[PDB]
């Protein structure tokens, strides 16, 4: 599977979650919200367009789930 992580503005990581192969999975963060993320199926990182990317958050790619 994909390895979704979660970071703020100053990128730390705050949240991590793992996205299904073509799949999406919601990832919750620590910051009072969550964030929907969803990999292809070649597994490739991207933020739903139904949510946006706030409060200086961002995306980041992990490693094996």
């Known amino acids: 599977n994909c390895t ?5 503005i100053n990128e730390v990581v705050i949240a ?3 996205v299904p192969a073509g799949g999406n999975l919601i990832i919750r963060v620590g910051s009072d919200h969550s964030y ?4 292809t199926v070649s597994c490739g990182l991207s933020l739903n367009p139904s ?8 995306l980041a790619s992990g490693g094996r789930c």
């Open 4 to 8: 979704a992580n979660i970071l703020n």
């Open 16 to 18: 991590t979650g793992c």
């Open 36 to 39: 929907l993320i969803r990999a």
């Open 51 to 58: 949510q946006s990317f706030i409060n200086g958050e961002s």
